[PDB]
Design a protein around this ligand. Structure first.
Ligand SMILES: NC(=[NH2+])c1ccc(N)cc1
Ligand SMILES: [Ca+2]
Lengths: 57, 235
């Protein structure tokens, strides 16, 4: 698949290295699940995310 | 931030404030437990800088605060206040003791040079800091934030008689009333990408605040992603 087509369905980053294959990758603190496209936190607090209730309720 | 809103505690975990000759004179962002990103012009030789992470009300004690001392300053090598003080306006700060990450102290995401530039193109960014809440007025006791649309490169270059280098960019409104102001520079300009925020800029300078016709100049972080990733990498 062209890595240019909808980012290759990769949640974050997409590429094409060896046999111009659409590889996905995440950013530090995240690891790629078996869903092979989505990223999952690999640390208690990954970057760029809010983890404090925005509501008291 | 003029024309902004009060942030909820823990809404921008990566945000930090800098204290020296004056309190909250500049902002910053957490790259990781030991590194902060900020503006180069915020670091005037001599002044001892103090960094507080987990900050909300700059006046009270929320118990989420974390103070740290800077044991090193690395301004971008192309930065030269003699020639110009806003060109290559980006610097790194190494903390003495590592910050303890939690819901109030979380780093910002820095993406590839290529994506950083794509996320910037999404049009909207979030800017936050404890700077002036009115052009020439008082500062904010509580962290303020504001969403700013990206401004046309042609428009940007035509708004000032000063040279806008390709290292910087414009954001803000044509109307005015809402802008970043002094005390905010060094702070983050983030873009949210499906619930995950990435640093897309650094609040640098401007001409007055929220004045119609003029915008806020931000450092195009995409041209610096690598330098950051390099000198902040942990060992
Ligand atoms: N956006 C601005 N006008 C601005 C931002 C920072 C600053 N220090 C001065 C002016
Ligand atoms: Ca406080």
């Amino acid at each position: 698949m062209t890595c240019n087509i909808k980012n290759g369905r990769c949640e974050q980053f997409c590429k094409n290295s060896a046999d111009n294959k659409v590889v996905c990758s995440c950013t530090e603190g995240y690891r790629l699940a078996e869903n092979q496209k989505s990223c999952e936190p690999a640390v208690p607090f990954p970057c760029g995310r809010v983890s404090v209730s925005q509501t008291s309720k | 931030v003029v024309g902004g809103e009060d942030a909820k505690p823990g809404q921008f975990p990566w945000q930090v404030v800098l204290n020296g000759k004056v309190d909250a004179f500049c902002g910053g962002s957490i790259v990781n437990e030991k590194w902060i990103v900020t503006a180069a012009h915020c670091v005037e030789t001599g002044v001892k800088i103090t960094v507080v992470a987990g900050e909300h009300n700059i006046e009270e004690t929320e118990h989420t605060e974390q103070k740290r001392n800077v044991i090193r300053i690395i301004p971008h090598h192309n930065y030269n206040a003699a020639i110009n003080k806003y060109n290559h306006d980006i610097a790194l700060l190494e903390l003495d003791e590592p910050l303890v990450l939690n819901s109030y102290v979380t780093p910002i995401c820095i993406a590839d040079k290529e994506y950083t530039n794509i996320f910037l193109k999404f049009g909207s960014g979030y800017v936050s800091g404890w700077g002036r809440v009115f052009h020439k007025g008082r500062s904010a006791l509580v962290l303020q934030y504001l969403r700013v649309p990206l401004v046309d490169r042609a428009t940007c270059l035509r708004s000032t008689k000063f040279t806008i280098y390709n290292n910087m960019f414009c954001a803000g409104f044509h109307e005015g009333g809402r802008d970043s102001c002094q005390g905010d520079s060094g702070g983050p300009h983030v873009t949210e990408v499906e619930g995950t925020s990435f640093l897309t800029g650094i609040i640098s300078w401007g001409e007055e605040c929220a004045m119609k016709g003029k915008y806020g100049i931000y450092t195009k972080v995409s041209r610096y992603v690598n330098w950051i990733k390099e000198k902040t990498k942990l060992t």
